[model samples]
Target: APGSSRVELFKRQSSKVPFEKDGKVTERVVHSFRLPALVNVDGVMVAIADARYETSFDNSLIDTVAKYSVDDGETWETQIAIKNSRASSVSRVVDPTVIVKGNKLYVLVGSYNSSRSYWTSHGDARDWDILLAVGEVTKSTAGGKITASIKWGSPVSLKEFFPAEMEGMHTNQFLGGAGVAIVASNGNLVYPVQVTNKKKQVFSKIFYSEDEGKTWKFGKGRSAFGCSEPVALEWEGKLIINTRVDYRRRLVYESSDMGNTWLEAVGTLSRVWGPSPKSNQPGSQSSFTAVTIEGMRVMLFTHPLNFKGRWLRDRLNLWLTDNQRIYNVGQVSIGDENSAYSSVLYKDDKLYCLHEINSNEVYSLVFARLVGELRIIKSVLQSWKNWDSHLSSICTPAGCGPAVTTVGLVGFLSHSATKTEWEDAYRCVNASTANAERVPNGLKFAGVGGGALWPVSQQGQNQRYFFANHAFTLVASVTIHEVPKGASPLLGASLDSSGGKKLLGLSYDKRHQWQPIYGSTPVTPTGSWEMGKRYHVVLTMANKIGSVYIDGEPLEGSGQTVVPDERTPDISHFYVGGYKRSGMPTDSRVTVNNVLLYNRQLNAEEIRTLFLSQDLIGTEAHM
Candidate 1:
């Protein structure tokens, strides 16, 4: 396979750092490492984060630490405190955003010196200030050895450079949000910042410098109240902010004149605002970056892809977009508890992600790379260029599928493997088969009470993250050899420990009709299934509503089942050809091909594309 994701725990809570207080230096445990920012300069990648010593709270003794890698993150230089509070005038320094241009880099951070929190604190001079740290990379070679070191300059306060209008707004507080700063095409350096007004309402805005950090000014426009932790990028000569909003989905605001005014964008992105089923916690910090390949613009984004439990923040996913449609490249790292505050950097066709994670009983910072995922992303981007013409060329027998896409795609099984081993093309999981042999298009299941099983664990990678949104589309091409005397399972997963409940499945009933099963209940459609005929069966669920489609046409009894939002279930395995039910009817001889699993329901146009085209993947490898 040409595509795979890699994650490395670069730093953890147990990692030690030297703190100097009262002229004495001592090792302190890094209580928490959060809010990652990354930048690449001349093949060297620099990563920065907030290192909290005494406690994990935001108001604790936090300092900004940095490390650089010359070998593309395979190894790292020794960690250094870029901005330590114990030896400095500020009580704490946290949340860094790094900007790099050639051999020089600048780090923008937030610092406060008082015991009071920045939110409640009053007065600009004594409460909170935005600080900038400058660094220059110096490389030397001697005796066949090459070394690179950073010469750090004294940290300077950007308060004197603030625009007059910004000072007039009574905006005294500032915080550096997660993610790296962007160098605009017109030589402007910009970074995202959260500002607190006199009324204590937080807003997201940009801090820009026209003379390369010599002079800084706050943007005239800002996000509405309840928005913070913004990430910005320059798109087509305009600045855009993907701001984290409270009590709603994350939003993208566009500003044509740098950051003087921002407006809510339309149809730029889809389904990124997570559905918070129970809790009211604001959305977590996400990373966003854009680049052009073959003169076509593409964007890379990272965020938690969970649906029901916003508080879980369990799985981190990398997404790709062509400004028209977004595709889930894959998961960066799967955490049982939380993976939050990610920053992304793309250079030399490789994508990098630095994220805050809780792993192995400790909160750590992870560095992940996307080589295989980037290959697939580039492949899909090229395919997307011909999407409109290709779809128009294909004949549509029914209405188009909806444009709604999923946040997480479980996997796709093309059934290209032989024997008892079935491979998932997405490389997420492999299934074990019983009495299934390789056929022309897929695998043929012999009628001997045999089935193919994908064993899933409640705590394993890729398995635990299945059906992340509790909404999914299970599509399969099935050919029945004969009509069964009783109903038999075709493809589905068990929802409970008892193994008698089916999450979603398509079965053949005694009346020779295709039945859609939803948790122990079957909705039999009006149409009958003919033997020796291949049909594309699609089972979908969205917003607690379930539906079934055959050959891109909805069944007579479709959209009637109301499935509950279950984040986690006591399931053992997902099955094909036969399911786990007491006295289950044996599956008839059937050939299953091109089984696709998605974490969201498919619309009409998507179903039609699958029904008419054999090469829906738009890649030569699949075809």
Candidate 2:
């Protein structure tokens, strides 16, 4: 029986472990609790973290601590120091990662051994050691109180197994990545290891054991640049390493042969693995775990939702993926204060998350059982099952009718021309038209003038679709009634007053080539607009770089730089056919339909699929 919904296993200064400083025994208040690792061994939930004393920095006198809960994290035992530092200065063991093989639990941590700071020496001075702590789990109940414990053996050094090739490269660091090690389907135990290069730049590799913990060896091939804190996973019998990159997106590598050689993952998990230049979120350390619900296997990821930028980590968000598209499972915890490193595990029928959160120096390790969030996941899985059955019965791209799954579709307008005003198929942003003819499958803009007006506030109100300063892809199917006699506006948005230059748009210059309108500068792509030919055109903005694509292919000379609109946070309106009367010439004539906007940049394949299928039935707006 669990006692509460949430548990604070290790609060600041909760464990009064004393240390000797200058021959005087003193108790330093625990400044921060970080790098959480969670595991469930035979129904016994164990949470581990680093208790930092003297200061919140990692080079402080840190001690690896643990708390056990036999009642499924309902009631936790007293906090215990798994490896306490009794040094007079900054000597300690930190950054613990755990794994369970059979009945034994294995814990790995980096032992500094002395006051040598990792930042200064890079742990390349041969003074650092990788300590392996072996423990056996026990569960018992007495006097109606359930208790769990781990009888830990003497911690041993595994530094001798360090790779020799990295000896001269300043790469002897064996820092554990504060997560759970994965057991491959072939019974190999693997852990992610962080090491530095000659320039002290961080990279992630792996250390694995074939016969349990008897022997361990390092894996070859380093991860992408500036990537660290590797999290390991055994996905579909392949070793997967999801490394935290130093940018907006994380990098995932796949190894088929026990991580001997690594290759970048393809086609799968792209929504989370791809980069977003305009995204304010920083690529921080995240936790991942795979679980089965209703016979369906799905993976879950949790990380700080740093929407404000790289500096503010205020919320922990959870996402679920079925190897293709990802669904935001919403925030597990949100606060004004910071919520950093996290680790997750699935046991019995519940989900557990142990994470470090709140305050800069007064951080605490908080444990939570995701009851409601897990329910939401289950409901989403059910919906996916139903959706699959329905799609199978009705249509699939392989046969029967056509369909396309638009993963990040924000707003869509079919331009069916049922009325003068068009309602956003997503039922969010509404658009009103002026001087347009209603045709069979779309609306026609006669050279005499006027375009569709979509107030940005209407779209901004829907937080899920508002993409003012973020990466976005705008798509439209347009038929040029005739080559424009002059520079004619197609579609665009203004971040400032309505009269200012368009922040982003497309136009047809008198030269008959497609012109990309980016801020004050317009560049011509290597394509001519044929009269009366419908072309699928797409405009994308990412990381201040704008591009134009036609019929699923990028236009030559299309990539142009556009400065981010720092003046306002929202676009006043997203216009269709024309931005303003001044930009809409008298000879401009076009028929436009199937306009769609996505919150993120669509890859080449996705754009091509949309053009080929010509369907909008699988997006959130239509589904």
Candidate 3:
């Protein structure tokens, strides 16, 4: 009885009370608790939550507290509560999270009043503070033969512990739907917080307590842009905090040293999926938490899957991962539509989860029997270091195998072996006269209107492998500093001996920098392009569709028919700036590298994989 789990600590009907809803007299809990953070104190369990006290879910004034279960929650006792103690501004303190570390318990609440005249007026996060409450865990040796209770001290000002590092630059706020502090193996106690500076810019970072929850500090690493509603946990021997932002997909940061720093943004997520770029909304909120799935090291995370209906946040999905590769390993649908923001815990054979369903008004607890198996595949992988295997994706219409050509990729970066020399690769320009150079990872051009090329040998033009067909895929990473007043070629295939048509060439149009051209015609799509930003551009064509992909995402208005004329497909050309309209090079200059060519058509998944998994390039350019 002293070494077993307190499995009953979370069970409760808490019964139902009549509450008018949807303009009708419906039945539900009058006052419900959401966002559960449970901690075991010897033989007792301490659960913390944001008590949606009467008639409100999010913005309305809410009371927060800690509920104790000495006999595994078959019964409960309210040990502490924080009400509208300072009736000022908008009088509110919501989103409560809790945790236990080294026998010490902690409770954090996002305390805020709208904004403005704070002492009496309430506005928004433009004004908010985090409240930290401390408590002690004790075991009574002469108790009713077992168990314990948590005695929390008076609430302390959370700001007293935050470091002054970001003091002059930003403000901090807590929206604790994500569970509370987690103690790492190294004894580091940490939590996530959202920041907004005087610049009105938004981002998220971590705050942690290293001296046994006595004090805290903020991280010195860069915060995620446009992110809020943050949470973290120790995973893969580090801290992984997943974040949400509007208008884009989800973003996550890995901290090797607790919450003190973060590595680069990752694309392979193990627990949650960000909103699709195709979908227009900041990704919905999701939280990162961990669990021992089937005795293996795995994480438990929660978020709404499927962007549907007008709101798009529905059908809460739970995910698990090990962070070995770049994505999640398993997933299970745990709730229906309107389900979101969940936290999980585990014992020997059972997994415990608590969530908000049907509105912040309704809370439900779910338990899953663990048999040690899950199904979560990495939906999107965005790494390009070694992506050749995923190419030659699919081939249809006879003359098919792995539908892609090996031209552009191995096509060589300028008849060059600065990296790797392609035996079947050819040079398309006068190397001796062109002002061109290649980097360990990219190629560059300075002047003399020159770049490099991969010539497709057909119709007895030159030597190398035969580019026997006309259909193709062109992939290359290009960046620009100064575009000439006129135009400069990025990269393309030229009809030197045949089609004579510049079937597809993305030449910079000075008239509109982002509006690249197809030969000399303005197509249906023109995506935004920044002056110094780099992007992976994948252009594919066959007799059916002529598509342009920027960084693996298809630009809007880009699906067209691909019909090659006497376009005796020629060489894949890279130019500084120029148009070989009729096999003649003009004066256009630019920087190009990582050029690739696939001989056939690529299917949907193949297109997505290539687009998402782009290469990371360096800044140093040379000639």
Candidate 4:
């Protein structure tokens, strides 16, 4: 071990703290000790806790020492135990610290017991104590359970370490051990411990072990008032401490003389580093413990950013530091707001973390190794700028074409057309005035007021309009008949539009007015063919099941029938417009234009792609 610096990180496996249930010490542990516990030693690599049940806790059994392995720091055979207790005893044991002195290892554990009253106390009332355990490495250390070599010493009385004025409150009560730093010059151990007085007020205290933890004393410094869950690091021969104050801020302190003297504490600078947003009071419940790794010190804090009525939705925030200030690095979410204890560590260039959740029924430990460098932060930002420019160019009015028509229709045209010129023409028509009557023959006015339509021609009487079926399909057929003299012509036929309809001949009778021949209900035609206005005409029949895309939007109308009768009144000629058999014709002009008929239905994906294409609908329309 001479002239060699090795970095290793390991988490402690400890027994769950026991609580009193029905007048007996419930053998079950109170807190969940999942794997990936985090540990920090000043000037050394961070160690994360990895815990596993020695035996199933359901068997009414408890393991004295939870095993742990170092991922980055020093290599040791024995596993570190976060919990040490007896089956006969009812107290829960957890929150451990390991200190390496010369050739020996010293482990410290905190013990607590919970009861129904404890739960009722809002985590305020509980019995807690601290115990010390020792272990030495043997020469033939060829790899047996390193934990087997551990020689647990008698429990030490922590009462002496508390201030005399803090008597009614338990003195040695160590709820959790946050930061443990060993002085390199003298091998002295300094630990940042969390304590709560009888008043339910939490405090951060510094404890020193002058004789390798054989005896303990309070460090020479002002206690951190109204704080808990302390974490500390010894950097550049100076000691810095961070402790949970309120939800919004974490108190920070520094010592120049190996925990002897301290300075006034300040709040953490980073806003995200503080409390859970889900707490009853935003920032009131945010608290954390700290760890140091690779010259970087990190604070593991838990709190929800936004509090809902439910507590299970809160998240954990991990605040990292490189000595200057705290910064948010990563986060892990938990289901319960009550579960807030967490441990974080960095080892082997990887980060390991753990937290108790779901009222201690389940615990989760996560491991994330640093696999790649984040050197592209600046490059990524620059790339975003370039992308924004490109998107703006494609989405602007001038760039895409015009805004007269719906962007969706323009995209559809761009994709359906084969040639770019056809696409450009479609774009021009859409972007031009709604009443621009200068379109070609195949296309005419088919919209409600002042819009465009697709024109279809019957080469002969037998030639039917061929339409492609897409995900969304809307088709309408209109029959324009001249008024007949001296006979009442009543038009009656199957009135649906799902399938195609056939014309039938009927006996001519006198005294009949304009009647619906084969369509659903008939509506009178109104409005004159004008040159420049918009219309409200829409497809009404087949639009429900399939899509009814007008310019490029899904058409909306009252639901009607889809099946039409095969035999209907025979009409010399018929016109198809945007109207189904609803009310009056939305647009003027008995002539139709832009008559697009498809057999297949068009899906949203296909519609978007087609709309975005340049050939059918121009980009300018969308822009």
Q: Evaluate all candidate structures by whole-model CA lDDT and list the values in order.
A: 0.67, 0.68, 0.51, 0.37
Please list the residue runs of candidate 1 whose C-alpha ends up more than 4 Å from where it truly belongs after superposition. 1-9, 18-29, 87-90, 116-125, 163-169, 275-279, 293-295, 306-312, 335-337, 359-361, 388-623
Q: How close is every model to the real structure, measured as TM-score? A: 0.61, 0.68, 0.52, 0.43
Alpha carbon deviation, residue 310, candidate 2 (Å): 7.4
Local distance difference test, candidate 1: 0.67
| lDDT tens digits by residue: candidate 1, 561-582 | 5555553344466677664233
Displacement of the residue 415 alpha carbon in candidate 4, Å: 42
Model 2 clashing residue pairs (backbone): 2-74
Q: What are the runs in model 2 whose C-alpha is more than 4 Å off?
A: 1-5, 15-31, 79-81, 84-88, 140-147, 167-170, 246-249, 265-283, 306-312, 375-390, 395-623
Best by TM-score: 2
Ranking by lDDT: 2, 1, 3, 4
**Per-residue lDDT over 1-623 for candidate 4, one digit per residue giving the tens place of the 0 to 100 score:** 11212111222233333333344654443223432334433223333332334422322222333333332423333333434344334444554565556545455555555422231134432354566656543333256522223343445656555564543454324543432334445567777766655555666666777776666776555445666656665655666666555533445677776556777432122221334332233332233434443333344344434334243434554443333222333345433343344554444445444444433344433333322211221223233233234333444233454322231221122211221112222221111123323332212333343322221111121111111111113222112222224321111111123112412101121232222222333422222312233221223222223222333444333233333444312222222322222232344232222222223444454444334432332223333
TM-score of 2: 0.68
Order of models, best TM-score first: 2, 1, 3, 4
Return the lDDT, model 4, position 391: 32
